[PDB]
Amino acid sequence: TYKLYIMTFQNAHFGSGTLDSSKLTFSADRIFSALVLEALKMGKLDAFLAEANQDKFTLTDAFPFQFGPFLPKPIGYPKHDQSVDVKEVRRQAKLSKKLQFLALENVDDYLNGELFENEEHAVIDTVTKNQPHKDDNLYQVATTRFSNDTSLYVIANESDLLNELMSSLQYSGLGGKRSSGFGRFELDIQNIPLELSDRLTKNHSDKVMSLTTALPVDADLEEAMEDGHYLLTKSSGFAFSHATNENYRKQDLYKFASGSTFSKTFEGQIVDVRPLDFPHAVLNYAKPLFFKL
Amino acid sequence: KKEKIDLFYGALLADIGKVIQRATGERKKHALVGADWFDEIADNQVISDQIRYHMANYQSDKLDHLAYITYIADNIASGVDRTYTNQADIFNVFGAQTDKRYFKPTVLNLKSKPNFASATYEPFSKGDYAAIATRIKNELAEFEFNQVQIDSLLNLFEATLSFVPSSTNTKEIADISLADHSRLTAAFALAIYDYLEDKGRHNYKEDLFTKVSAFYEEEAFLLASFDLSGIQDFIYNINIATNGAAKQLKARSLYLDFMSEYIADSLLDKLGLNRANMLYVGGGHAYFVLANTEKTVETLVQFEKDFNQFLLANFQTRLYVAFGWGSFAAKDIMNSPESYRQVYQKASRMISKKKISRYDYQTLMLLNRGGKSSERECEICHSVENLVSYHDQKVCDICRGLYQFSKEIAHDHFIITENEGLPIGPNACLKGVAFEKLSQEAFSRVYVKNDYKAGTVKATHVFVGDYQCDEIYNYAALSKNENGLGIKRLAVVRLDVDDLGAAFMAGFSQQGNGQYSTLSRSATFSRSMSLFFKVYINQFASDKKLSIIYAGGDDVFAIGSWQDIIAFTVELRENFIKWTNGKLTLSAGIGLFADKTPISLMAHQTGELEEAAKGNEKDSISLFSSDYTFKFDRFITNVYDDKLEQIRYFFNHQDERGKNFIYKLIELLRNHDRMNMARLAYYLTRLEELTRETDRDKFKTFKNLFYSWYTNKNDKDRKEAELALLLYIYEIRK
Amino acid sequence: TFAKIKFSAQIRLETGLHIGGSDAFAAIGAINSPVIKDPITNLPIIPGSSLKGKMRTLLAKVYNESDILSRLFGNSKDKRFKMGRLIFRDAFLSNADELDSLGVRSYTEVKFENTIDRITAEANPRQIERAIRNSTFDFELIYEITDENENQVEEDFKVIRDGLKLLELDYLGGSGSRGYGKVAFENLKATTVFGNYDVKTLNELLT
Numbered sequence A: 001t002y003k004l005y006i007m008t009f010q011n012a013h014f015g016s017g018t019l020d021s022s023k024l025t026f027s028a029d030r031i032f033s034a035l036v037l038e039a040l041k042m043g044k045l046d047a048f049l050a051e052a053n054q055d056k057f058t059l060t061d062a063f064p065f066q067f068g069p070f071l072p073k074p075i076g077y078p079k080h081d082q083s084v085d086v087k088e089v090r091r092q093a094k095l096s097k098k099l100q101f102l103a104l105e106n107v108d109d110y111l112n113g114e115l116f117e118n119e120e121h122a123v124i125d126t127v128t129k130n131q132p133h134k135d136d137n138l139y140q141v142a143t144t145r146f147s148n149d150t151s152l153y154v155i156a157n158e159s160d161l162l163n164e165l166m167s168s169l170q171y172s173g174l175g176g177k178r179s180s181g182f183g184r185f186e187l188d189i190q191n192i193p194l195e196l197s198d199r200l201t202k203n204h205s206d207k208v209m210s211l212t213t214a215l216p217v218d219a220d221l222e223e224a225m226e227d228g229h230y231l232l233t234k235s236s237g238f239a240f241s242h243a244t245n246e247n248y249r250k251q252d253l254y255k256f257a258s259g260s261t262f263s264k265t266f267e268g269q270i271v272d273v274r275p276l277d278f279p280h281a282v283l284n285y286a287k288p289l290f291f292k293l
Numbered sequence B: 001k002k003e004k005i006d007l008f009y010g011a012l013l014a015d016i017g018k019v020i021q022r023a024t025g026e027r028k029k030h031a032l033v034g035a036d037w038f039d040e041i042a043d044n045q046v047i048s049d050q051i052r053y054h055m056a057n058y059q060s061d062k063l064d065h066l067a068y069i070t071y072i073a074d075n076i077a078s079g080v081d082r083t084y085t086n087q088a089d090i091f092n093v094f095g096a097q098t099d100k101r102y103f104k105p106t107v108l109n110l111k112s113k114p115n116f117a118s119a120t121y122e123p124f125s126k127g128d129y130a131a132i133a134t135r136i137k138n139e140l141a142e143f144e145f146n147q148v149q150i151d152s153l154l155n156l157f158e159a160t161l162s163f164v165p166s167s168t169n170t171k172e173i174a175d176i177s178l179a180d181h182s183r184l185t186a187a188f189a190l191a192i193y194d195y196l197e198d199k200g201r202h203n204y205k206e207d208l209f210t211k212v213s214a215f216y217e218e219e220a221f222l223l224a225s226f227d228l229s230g231i232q233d234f235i236y237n238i239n240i241a242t243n244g245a246a247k248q249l250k251a252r253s254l255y256l257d258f259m260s261e262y263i264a265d266s267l268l269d270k271l272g273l274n275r276a277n278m279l280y281v282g283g284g285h286a287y288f289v290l291a292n293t294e295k296t297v298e299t300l301v302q303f304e305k306d307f308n309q310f311l312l313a314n315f316q317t318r319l320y321v322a323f324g325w326g327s328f329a330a331k332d333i334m335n336s337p338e339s340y341r342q343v344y345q346k347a348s349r350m351i352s353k354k355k356i357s358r359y360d361y362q363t364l365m366l367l368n369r370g371g372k373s374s375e376r377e378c379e380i381c382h383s384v385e386n387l388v389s390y391h392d393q394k395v396c397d398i399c400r401g402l403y404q405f406s407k408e409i410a411h412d413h414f415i416i417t418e419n420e421g422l423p424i425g426p427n428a429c430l431k432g433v434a435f436e437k438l439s440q441e442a443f444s445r446v447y448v449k450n451d452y453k454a455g456t457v458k459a460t461h462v463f464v465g466d467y468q469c470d471e472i473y474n475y476a477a478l479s480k481n482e483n484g485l486g487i488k489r490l491a492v493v494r495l496d497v498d499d500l501g502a503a504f505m506a507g508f509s510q511q512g513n514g515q516y517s518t519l520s521r522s523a524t525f526s527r528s529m530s531l532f533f534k535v536y537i538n539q540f541a542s543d544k545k546l547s548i549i550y551a552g553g554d555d556v557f558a559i560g561s562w563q564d565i566i567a568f569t570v571e572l573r574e575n576f577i578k579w580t581n582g583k584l585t586l587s588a589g590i591g592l593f594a595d596k597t598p599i600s601l602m603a604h605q606t607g608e609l610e611e612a613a614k615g616n617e618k619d620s621i622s623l624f625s626s627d628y629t630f631k632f633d634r635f636i637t638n639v640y641d642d643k644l645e646q647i648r649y650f651f652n653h654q655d656e657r658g659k660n661f662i663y664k665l666i667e668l669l670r671n672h673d674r675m676n677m678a679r680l681a682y683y684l685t686r687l688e689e690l691t692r693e694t695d696r697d698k699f700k701t702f703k704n705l706f707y708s709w710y711t712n713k714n715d716k717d718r719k720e721a722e723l724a725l726l727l728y729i730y731e732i733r734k
Numbered sequence C: 001t002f003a004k005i006k007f008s009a010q011i012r013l014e015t016g017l018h019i020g021g022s023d024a025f026a027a028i029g030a031i032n033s034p035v036i037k038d039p040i041t042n043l044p045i046i047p048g049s050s051l052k053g054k055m056r057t058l059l060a061k062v063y064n065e066s067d068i069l070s071r072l073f074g075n076s077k078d079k080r081f082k083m084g085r086l087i088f089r090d091a092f093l094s095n096a097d098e099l100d101s102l103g104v105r106s107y108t109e110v111k112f113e114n115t116i117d118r119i120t121a122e123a124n125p126r127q128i129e130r131a132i133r134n135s136t137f138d139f140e141l142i143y144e145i146t147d148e149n150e151n152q153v154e155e156d157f158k159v160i161r162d163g164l165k166l167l168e169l170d171y172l173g174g175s176g177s178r179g180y181g182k183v184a185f186e187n188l189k190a191t192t193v194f195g196n197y198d199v200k201t202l203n204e205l206l207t
C-alpha cells in the first residue's frame, strides 16, 4: 500500500495466452511468479513465502505512468445518468472499448461523465522470426515496444527483500522472451500521491474497484459475484520448473480481471494451481488491493 | 399446442387474397378472395374463417373464433391504424433524401442477376403477377397443416413475395413487402395467443374487438434479443504455420453461423414459436418477438443457462450467448419516437449488463476445481479435453470436427443429429450431408444453404456467402493470363460497410420526426442487407477466379487472384451503391501478396489496410499499402477506368517506350519534390522528340496529359497516376 | 553466491547489416527487403534473438560434443537447463549523432543488387536496405551467477569470449555470405550490477 515501483520497460512480451499477442499489463501473477523464481536462485524462497502469507505485503498489476499514475476503467461505471446524438453514442462505443486506462486526476471526473479519447502508448508490434535450415521454423513474437514516456508501476508494500527482488528484476527480465531481449527494465521507486494513498483500501465496503486479478475465498464469492461488474481472465499456461524433465500445464485458473467493480469488498487467496503429482507448489497470486470509487 | 397451428396459418395467410385481386383486378376485399381461393387447394374452416373475419369491415357477425386475434395481429402489423404504385425501396426514407426508387415486382432465383430499383418502375404492372400467382398455387399444391409443412411455406414467400407491395392505397407505410408484413403478423399472433392463453382468458370478442384499446396498452410483447460474444476472435484463432489454411476459416465462420441459427431455432421450440417470430438473425445478434409472460421469461433464463453450460463445456469462455428482453405494449405505432428507441434500449442494456456479470457462484467454483493433470495441449485452442493424434500432432475435439466440417462444407444440406460431427447445442451435433444420403440418417432439423426450392423434407433455408472457383494455392498461378500478362500474386479484400451500427441504431430516424424508424422497416432493411451480402455476392463473383472465404453482416473477406479481386471489389461497390441508393458507403482494403504466404500474416495486414481505409474518411479503398488510399468515388472512375484505360490505350499502340519509361515515371511520381516537376518537364520533352517522328502526337497528347496530372496541385490527381502505373506494370509483367 | 555481471560493448559495423522482418508490400520503386527497425524512433536495431541464435549456432560448431552450450543458453527438454544462465538485449544504435558528426544523410542505405541467369543471361534486380557502415550499437549481455553456477564460471568465460571472438569472424546478419556482416566489438567491459562479486580479474581476459 506504500510506494509504487516505476519500471521502465522499452520492450516486452506479455502473453495473453499466445506467442502472437501481448498484453499491456501483467495481471500481478507475473510479477509474483518473477519474485518467487528469482528468490530461488538466491535461496530466499521460504522467507518470501512466509512473508507472502501475511498482510505485510500486497501486490498490484501494472498500469501506465505517462507523467502520472493510471488505473483501469471502472468496468460497468458510469451508470445510467441523455437522449441526444443517437449517432454520437455509437462513436464512443468503439473508442471506449479501447479506453481501459484512466489517470488519477480524472478518474473521479470520468464517473461524473467525460470522454478521454484514449492516448497511445506502447504500440504492439509483431515481428517474424525463424530457426533457419530446420523443419518448422516460423513463429511470431508480438513485442510491446513502449512509447518513450511510459512506465509500468506495481503498487506494493516496501520491504527490503522486496526491494532486493524488484531490483534483481531490473536485469533478470520480466515478460515473455526474457532470454532474448524482451521485458528488461529499470526501476525507480517514487511517491504515491496523497489522493492515491488514502484510497487503496482492503476493507472499505461500498462501491469499490479492484486493482489486481484476485480470486475471493469460496465463502465470500457468492455475493462477490452478486453485484460485481467484472471480467474473467483465464490465467493458465505451463508451470515453469526445474524438477520435471517434461513440461506440464498449470491448473486452469479463472480470475476477476483488474477493473472489476465490487460492492462490499472481499478477501483474496493464493490459489495453489499445482499439477497432479508435482513436487513444489505453484502459487498464482490472487489477493486484492482496492480503490474506493 | 393443438389450435396454434391453424391460427398461424390463418393470420399469416390472410391478405394473400391481396395477390389474387391484384392479379385479376377485382375490387372485392381480400378477406373474401383469399378465403375463397384457399378452399380450392385445401379444406380448413379454421384457416378460411380466419382469412374471412380478419378485416372486420366486410362481415364479422358470425363469431369465439381465432378470428379476433387474426384481427388484432393485423392491426399491430402496420405502423398506423390499418393505388397503382409498386413497392417502394427501403432507402427512400433511409438517412438522406434522393430520388425515390421502386421495385420491379418479380420473384427470386439462385443464378439470378440482381434486382436493383429505379424511379422508372413507379406505375403498376398487373400482368407481371401471373408468374407469381400460379407459383403460389402449384408449389403449395398438395399442402397440409403441421410442423413438417410449417416452415417451407416461409421460404416460399421469400423467393416470391419479397418484392410485392402491401396496402397500395396509403402513403406512409409503403416500403414494407408482403413477405415481411405477413411474417410480422403471424409473429405477433402467436405472441398474443401465448400471452392470453397463459393467463386463462378463453374469449376474444370482449377482450380483442371492443376492449382492444385497453389490451392495446397492456404490456404484452417481449422484444427479445440475443448476442453471441466472441465470434470474431473465434474465427481468427489461426496463427502462422497452420494446416487448414482457409478451409478452417470458411468452416469456422459457417460453424458460428449455424450455432447462431440453432439458437434462434431451438429457442422457439422450447417456446411455442416458429421461424416467423425471429425478426432478424445474423452476425451474432438476433431479434425476436415473444409473449410477455413468465412462461417465456423462465424458459429464456433456463435456456440461456443451459446453453451457456453447453458453451462452457467445450469452448471455455471463448464464446458466450447473452440474452435480453424489453417489454412493451402495442405502442410502437404512430411519445411515438421515444417508445421504439426505449424498448430497443432495454434489451441492449440487459445484454450489456449480462456481458459483464457472466456466471453464477457454482459454475465459477466448478470452473477452477482443479484435479486436472496435463502434459499436452491443443496448439490451436489451448484446451485439454479429448486430445487425439490428428496428422502427427495433438488436436482437440472441436478442431477435429472442424476439419470434418470443412470437408462437408461443399454440400447443400446440413442436418443436426445427436452424435455426428460438430456440437452446436445440448445434445445436438451438426453434420453436413448430400441430398441422397438423407434417407439413411435421422435428422431433427435440416438447413439448406442458399436455395429457394421447395425442398424434400420441408427444410429450413439459410443463407451463407459461398464461392470457390479453385484452390487457394492455385490463385497466384491463375493470375498469369493467356500471354503471361500478369504478376504472380494473389490479393485479399476485406470489405466492410461503414457505420453499420449507425445504420441499425438510428438508421431511419434521419428522415422525418422519428416516425420512420419502426419495426417493419428495420426487419426489412436487415433482410435486405443479409440478402445482399450473403446471396448476391456469388452473382458478382460468378465468373471470377476467387474464393469468398467469409461474407455477410457487413464484413467480407475474400481471397483470390488479383485482377479478379480488384474487379470484384469494383463490381461490389458499383452494385451496392445501386442497391443502397448511394447511401451506406462501404470501405474495402486490398492487399497484394506473394504465393505461399500464410493466411494469418495475410489476413492481419489486410485488416490493418482496411481499418486505415476506414480511418482515411468515412469511405475509402486502401489498395495494396497504407499510402495508396483513395475513395471509391474516385478509384473506380478515375484510377481504374479513366487513367488506366488511357495508359493502356497509349502504351499498347506503340512499340518504342517499354517498361523502362513506366518505371522511371513511377520513380518520379514517388520521390516528388517540386524540382521533380522540372525534371519531368525535361524528361517528357526530351522523349517527345526522341520518338519516331511519324507517330509523335500520340506521345505529345500523352505527355501533355501526364504533365497535366503531375502539376495539377490538388494532391488527388497524382497518386491516381502512380497507382494506375503500378496496376499497368502489374498487368504487363512477363 | 549470487550476482549479475553484464557485458557492455559498442558493436561496430564494418560492412552493412541486413536483418529482415515481417514481409511488407513493395510498391515498385520501394525497397523489397527492408531492414527491421524500432517502431517508435524509426531507427535500425539488432534484436536480441538474432544474437542469441547467432552466437549459439557459432559455438555449436566449436563445442559440438552440447552440455556447455545447453547450460549457457538453455535447453527446454533438460530439467537442469530450462531458462539457464544468459540474457541478451537489443542494440539501440548509440551513435545516432556521431553519424551526423561524421556527416551522413539517412541511417540506412539501399544497396542495389541483381540476379543473372546462366541460360538467358538476364538480370533480375533487388534492393536491399542496409544499416550503414561504422554505426555503433549498445550491446550488453547479462550473465547471472547462482549457486549451481559455481565452480564452472571459468569455462563460461573462455566460451563467451570465445563466442565474441567468433562474431568478428562470421557475419551476424542476413545475406552474410555476400558481405553484410563484419561486426566488431569495442569497449568490451564486464561490470557488475546487483551483486557482490568482483570482475577485475575477468576484465583483463577481455581487454
Ligand SMILES: [Zn+2]
Binding pocket: B378, B380, B381, B382, B383, B396, B398, B399
Ligand atoms: Zn478448439
